[PDB]
């Protein structure tokens, strides 16, 4: 078996995770459950990034310990991975020691090879962002005798604060041109290559400054061996976990070796700089292979802007799971919002996709063709024969070019694409009820075979749809099944859609139709 590793981000438990994170998780879920039924051996990673002062001063707050409020955060966070059926293969947390260890060995090593040291980092910093930033970079930067002596970050807007402490270096500068070279050589390696140019003139034209890896001022974070008073910066800390999680370093790298390089690290775009400079550079730094790709999706936005937990202008995944069902919710994040552009949130959005693509156009396509089976054939669906209308031929060609266009989108993880594609083919069979009157082949007994082949299309049709979303939906395409009493678990797979017409036994669908949905 091919092997495929794609990874999350692990995220900031510094409060409760909004539909923005649901997208990425649910992105990673959709081509991990793709990639599994290609017949690929997939490991899936997420998890938490729980070191550094934004989380100490939150477990501060909260009158708890970092380890207290972490548990308490975490068990949030798994709660609604379990609830969005996120099938994740691994969760890594950066408090673990399979992680900490991994680190360790990464900082003691570039010491050693000289790559990292000692200095002292004089400049700003945002706690929110954990982010270094050059004077010019602050907004509504703050003037006193000619000087900037206060600002904000240009990512959140919260203030920053002065920094001057002592911090080990990571020379990043040296480099340079190998990281430009690397560019060169792959322009495909950050998708959309839409975000390469900006990322290359905003961080690397001005010149790779030299990495701030430590601090002393707080003792939140992996600990350095030989320098224990220091404590690594989050974000070295952080990016180690893509291969802390297979047993980098340790006794036995057969996870590593069989999983790394990933195939896909995803992200939004406002953390593409951290996957595609730093990320590359400690990895040749440890002589290491790359990713193959980074995937920045966009942002998800309400009217005040981008989707933020610090913020507070959040959409909870909980409220529209718990009132809408998981379907509504996975479809809702995949579909309204293409991943290579932002999308604005709207209740109004939400409820239009939820009733009218997933209630009407598949709940009524499913509810409409067993009715007709029940009524004309007493639940006994005939055989599929072979394309005996007139309009069959046509329609079995765009079933099979429904499924290689949706393959098209899927690897280059058009997701919202894939699913308009699928919806195409679910209209055209809502459609080919419409054309063929079914009803009035159900007058004469001439008519019967006929009538049998527009029942055996159209429970074919959506036999396709079912196959061809069972990466997106976790509940509807089980339901189809049992619904229709398609019990062979060969015709649930993708290969089962490579010639049109597989039920060519008859088949008692339910007597009890049931809603699809929600
Ligand atoms: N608005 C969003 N749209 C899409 N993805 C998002 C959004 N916000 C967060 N994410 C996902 O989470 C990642 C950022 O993780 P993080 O824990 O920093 O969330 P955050 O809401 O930006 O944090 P905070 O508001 O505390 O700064 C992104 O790279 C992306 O994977
Ligand atoms: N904003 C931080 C969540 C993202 C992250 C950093 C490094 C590795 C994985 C995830």
Same mark, same amino acid.
């Given at each position: 078996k091919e092997t495929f590793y794609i990874t999350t981000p692990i995220y900031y438990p510094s409060g409760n995770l909004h539909i923005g994170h649901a997208y990425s998780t649910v992105a990673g879920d959709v081509i991990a459950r793709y990639k599994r039924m290609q017949g690929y051996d997939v490991r899936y990673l997420?998890?938490?990034?729980?070191?550094?002062?934004? !989380?100490?001063?939150?477990? /501060?707050?909260?009158? =708890?310990? #970092? &380890?207290?409020?972490?548990?308490?955060? !975490?068990?949030?966070?798994? /709660?609604?991975?379990? =609830?969005? #059926? &996120?099938?994740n293969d691994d969760?890594?947390?950066?408090?673990?020691?399979?992680?900490?260890?991994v680190v360790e060995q990464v900082f003691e090593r570039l010491l050693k090879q000289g790559d990292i040291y000692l200095g002292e980092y004089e400049g700003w910093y945002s706690v929110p962002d954990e982010t270094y930033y050059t004077e010019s970079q602050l907004v509504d930067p703050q003037y006193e005798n000619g000087k900037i002596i206060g600002g904000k970050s240009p990512d959140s807007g919260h203030e920053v604060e002065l920094v001057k402490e002592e911090s080990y270096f990571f020379n990043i500068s040296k480099y340079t041109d190998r990281l430009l070279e690397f560019y060169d050589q792959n322009p495909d390696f950050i998708q959309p290559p839409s975000r390469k140019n900006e990322m290359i003139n905003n961080f690397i034209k001005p010149g790779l400054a030299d990495l701030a890896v430590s601090r002393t001022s707080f003792n939140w974070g992996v600990h350095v061996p030989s320098n224990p008073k220091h404590v690594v910066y989050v974000w070295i800390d952080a990016l180690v976990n893509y291969i802390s999680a297979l047993g980098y370093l340790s006794d036995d790298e057969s996870l590593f070796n069989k999983y790394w390089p990933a195939d896909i690290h995803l992200m939004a775009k406002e953390i593409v700089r951290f996957h595609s400079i730093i990320w590359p550079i400690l990895l040749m730094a440890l002589d290491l292979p790359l990713p193959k790709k980074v995937f920045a999706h966009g942002w998800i936005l309400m009217k005040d802007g981008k989707m933020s937990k610090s913020k507070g202008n959040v959409v909870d995944?909980?409220?529209?799971?718990?009132?809408?069902?998981?379907?509504?919710?996975?479809?809702?994040?995949?579909?309204?919002?293409?991943?290579?552009?932002?999308?604005?949130?709207?209740?109004?959005?939400?409820v239009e996709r939820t009733n009218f693509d997933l209630a009407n156009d598949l709940g009524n396509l499913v509810n409409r063709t067993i009715s007709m089976?029940?009524?004309?054939?007493?639940?006994?669906?005939?055989?599929?024969?072979?394309?005996?209308?007139?309009?069959?031929?046509?329609?079995?060609?765009?079933?099979?070019?429904?499924?290689?266009?949706?393959?098209?989108?899927?690897?280059?993880?058009?997701?919202?694409?894939?699913?308009?594609?699928?919806?195409?083919?679910?209209?055209?069979?809502?459609?080919?009820?419409?054309?063929?009157?079914?009803?009035?082949?159900?007058?004469?007994?001439?008519?019967?075979?006929?009538?049998?082949?527009?029942?055996?299309?159209?429970?074919?049709?959506?036999?396709?749809?079912?196959?061809?979303?069972?990466?997106?939906?976790?509940?509807?395409?089980?339901?189809?099944?049992?619904?229709?009493?398609?019990?062979?678990?060969?015709?649930?797979?993708?290969?089962?859609?490579?010639?049109?017409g597989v039920l060519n036994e008859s088949i008692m669908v339910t007597g009890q139709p049931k809603p699809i949905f929600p």
């Open positions: 997420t998890g938490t990034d729980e070191h550094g002062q934004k !989380i100490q001063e939150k477990a /501060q707050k909260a009158g =708890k310990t #970092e &380890i207290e409020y972490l548990d308490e955060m !975490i068990a949030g966070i798994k /709660q609604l991975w379990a =609830k969005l #059926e &996120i099938s969760f890594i947390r950066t408090t673990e020691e399979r992680h900490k260890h995944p909980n409220i529209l799971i718990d009132r809408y069902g998981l379907d509504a919710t996975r479809y809702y994040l995949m579909r309204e919002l293409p991943f290579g552009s932002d999308g604005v949130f709207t209740p109004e959005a939400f089976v029940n009524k004309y054939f007493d639940g006994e669906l005939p055989a599929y024969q072979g394309p005996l209308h007139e309009l069959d031929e046509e329609m079995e060609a765009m079933a099979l070019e429904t499924v290689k266009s949706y393959t098209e989108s899927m690897e280059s993880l058009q997701f919202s694409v894939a699913l308009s594609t699928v919806w195409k083919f679910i209209s055209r069979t809502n459609k080919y009820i419409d054309e063929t009157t079914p009803w009035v082949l159900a007058k004469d007994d001439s008519q019967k075979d006929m009538l049998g082949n527009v029942m055996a299309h159209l429970v074919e049709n959506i036999r396709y749809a079912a196959v061809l979303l069972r990466p997106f939906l976790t509940h509807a395409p089980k339901e189809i099944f049992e619904q229709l009493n398609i019990n062979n678990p060969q015709f649930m797979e993708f290969s089962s859609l490579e010639q049109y």
